[PDB]
Design a protein around this ligand. Structure first.
Ligand code: 7KO
Ligand code: 7KO
Ligand code: 7KO
Ligand code: 7KO
Ligand code: 7KO
Ligand code: NAG
Ligand code: NAG
Lengths: 217, 211, 211, 211, 213
């Protein structure tokens, strides 16, 4: 078991060394630039429509927001570090995209630890669970066809020149939706949109989350 | 080339942010102008039991510092960059009649351009003093809130708007409240006692329930 | 030259904050007088099910430290500056009958003058203990709340007001509550807990539902 | 020998922390088993308008690390100590179906024992998804919530319970809700995407309006 | 005035000698146990929620303890007998309500008073929601509720508690509160658990109150 004990100690030293090599010894990645655009993949896992407030036209959602991207500055050779193929790290240690809901009515509440997973190909996976209030008229929610609301997500400060967005699919993952929610989901889609606004020449990109729902009976 | 671009940005940031480090803010001898513009998104609620109304808007702030200027050719034709608002000086623009601390809805990041201008656009939810009486009539109700520096007079920070028309192109079409008009107007207030003039931007909103 | 004003400002602040260790707070040997003045902006809410009332006001704080003074001639004739409240010592002025933590409505920035004078004016929303019984009568209701240091007795911190009249000139004219009177009065208190006198400023507000 | 008791404790912590390499968290090579146990104190509220229920409980977490071991003999027979949760690694245990961020009710301090085991017990108020339909009947309502690592799969973190019976010995005897049963059960599952198994502890509560 | 400058320099020298010169106190231990004195000053019962059985109290919680590592001879420091310091600069006890339902909200500055004998006084003002059935509050007999306070992580072998009296101080109780106080006591308690070997100490705050008439 001495050998086993030693192998454990070595794997610890190797993880600490990989983290030293990527961070502490190398620059904090400054973010994407026009010559060097970054694509961030987004996908939503809708867990619950908690509340629909017809007195203020706000609706509260809980969901997991999957964010994926990939950087060269986060790559490593797993054979240089004892076959370490990935690691968990505090979101504070790396750059993360400023993905923002554009029509929230209260600051998002974070429901999960701010830790991401980094893989040897340099891909990052960060999945914040969130409670969000957003502008939404729930009239029709007490009808067969229910209510329809939409909310757009995207970078706040990086245009389409610097950050692009994609989805893997336009279907929101509903396999974890709360079976006894006050509201049943009729459909939920997530769709990339590209936009040009009157002012600027930068194209603007978002993912539009559209939810159709009604009072469960 | 990727590493080169990345290197250029990091070199610029280094030159700017610590070589002659944190900017001490404006003074009478080195004053500054902040341009303000509002993009009104939603009147979320009106409480006539307390005379508070809740607004959601984007507040566009713009200013310019010589200490933020650079030549793009010296840094790989980098014309701009994004940085955390805590890495730079920011103006203390404040609503003068809020009743609750402002809630911030957008990342605290700004865009700096090679000519030394900064654009910082905090999205905000604000509760402020407002009597909604009449909001359910044809005339609607009218409320106003002033914005400006808390600690700097007009001798250190001037305020400006590009237009006195609030941007309503993003106003929530299914809001409980419709906008009849919204203006943003520079005001100057002088006082006999103190020789410094005080500057604000008055946001005036006229609004009504739907019909 | 604009450059040189900046260098001068940064150097003054480095001399005052770095080229000397901070002010340790007042002592019995070196007591401190703080002047307080209230600018009452709004009575927002009066909850008769809980006997709490919510106020919005500006609280003016003034004091003076020999350790903050300088000769304007050594520093390009800079006579004053703005600085973050965290850079200097600030008095721990506390509402004695609050029922919730004070909510801060203004930026935490103070103004320091070359004579050692500091002016700090936090805007605050406060819930405090108050029976609003009679608020819906001509006579109105009456409430009070004391402000003073939490940890310094009158031997270390003394309080003053410039007047006994709360500044009502910015009071919100469409508030649900009209102010009948508002006074601020220094009091010398003896508490059974402690052999040292404690000083407060007592804010008394008389108000009623509006006509 | 009390100054010596003190000096020994300081050395131990200095030895373990500000010296020896600290744990970088568990890996597929060096996995960690975390024991969870719940002490249910109160069901505060059941909201049938939103299907949320608020619980107050103590969450017992226990794990063991070689890098936290020591021989009490080298340290004045110190067998355990208390230290801030921020000095050591702690597991990211998370309710999978909360609807608000958890509110912590107890200080963030852990107990570490010479065998390298750590005991951390945060008291929490949790809102989670729960349909309380039937709570006003004899059969009562049943709700469940899963707890597990957010970012570590079963390959890095395994979970266990010491018992499948929730500790009810501190349940508030005058709660609006009576507990009919509460269990805590380890579960394993996979998702068609991934080969790594996922481990949680499922907290199942049956409760009804008290009579 | 040079005298004032000199006192200030002594106070700074003391604080630096006490802290940044002596490695922060690691907390009490089996061999170095500590006694914490607790007293409550009840200011208000703000709210009694009968739909959730939560009651909200506003009170000052007095805490006192003494450490050898904080003592000094005034004669070596310009006869300073005491000073005020941020509560972050020193160890403070982890005194906790055992049946709160919301995190405590702090109403006073986090600053304590240390005196040359090594003793410390820290008095945080707090609003607390805790588990309490206010049934009977609108009657002559009133309602009775209780809430324990004690260390969360130290047992009786490391932290003992004491009260100077078993009567809660009511002299600052708000005279126009919705609720009047029939009685309020604060009593040291020793408990043992089956889970654990060591005995546990708390102070039990019992309050009897009713709707004011
Ligand atoms: N000129 C402009 N106006 C507005 Cl009112 C918002 C906006 N932003 C945020 C922003 C923040 C800092 C610097 N540049 C841009 C981008 C945006 C906002 C909303 C939806 N899509 C993009 N840009
Ligand atoms: N003498 C004085 N009195 C007051 Cl009641 C406020 C004040 N202000 C705040 C203010 C308020 C409204 C509009 N513009 C500015 C300026 C200020 C703030 C902080 C420190 N010094 C001056 N200065
Ligand atoms: N002995 C003692 N007991 C109490 Cl119940 C409060 C107290 N205070 C706070 C106070 C001061 C004036 C008016 N209301 C409250 C002074 C103090 C002393 C030492 C540490 N912190 C506060 N000191
Ligand atoms: N074994 C154990 N289990 C529990 Cl359910 C709680 C606990 N306590 C003590 C305690 C004392 C009085 C009231 N509630 C809790 C807190 C604790 C925290 C961290 C390590 N050890 C004990 N210790
Ligand atoms: N692919 C993926 N997608 C989602 Cl929608 C969540 C997720 N989780 C969270 C989770 C949720 C429920 C039960 N166990 C774990 C794991 C995770 C979180 C952060 C980074 N990488 C993986 N991983
Ligand atoms: C019972 C036991 O194993 N303890 C031993 C004992 O020989 C020694 O005297 C003590 C320190 O006093 O610690 C060690
Ligand atoms: C350092 C200092 O100022 N201390 C003086 C000391 O000379 C004097 O003997 C004593 C009287 O009580 O205290 C005072």
């Amino acid at each position: 078991d001495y050998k086993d004990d030693d192998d454990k100690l070595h794997s610890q030293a190797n993880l600490m060394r990989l983290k030293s090599d990527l961070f502490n010894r190398s620059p904090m990645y400054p973010g994407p630039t026009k010559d060097d655009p970054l694509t961030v993949t987004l996908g939503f896992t809708l867990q619950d429509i908690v509340k629909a407030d017809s007195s203020t036209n706000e609706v509260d959602l809980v969901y997991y927001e999957q964010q994926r991207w990939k950087l060269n500055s986060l790559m490593w050779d797993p054979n240089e570090y004892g076959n370490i193929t990935d690691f968990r790290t505090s979101a504070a240690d790396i750059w993360t995209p400023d993905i923002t809901a554009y029509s929230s009515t209260r600051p998002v509440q974070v429901l999960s630890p701010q830790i991401a997973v980094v893989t040897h190909d340099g891909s990052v996976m960060f999945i914040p669970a969130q409670r969000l209030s957003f502008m939404c008229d729930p009239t029709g929610v007490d009808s067969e066809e229910g209510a329809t609301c939409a909310v757009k997500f995207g970078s706040w400060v990086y245009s389409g020149f610097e950050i692009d967005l994609k989805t893997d699919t336009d279907q929101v993952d509903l396999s974890s939706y709360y079976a006894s929610s006050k509201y049943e989901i009729l459909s939920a889609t997530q769709t990339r949109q590209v936009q040009h606004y009157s002012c600027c020449p930068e194209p603007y990109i978002d993912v539009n989350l559209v939810v159709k729902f009604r009072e469960r009976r």
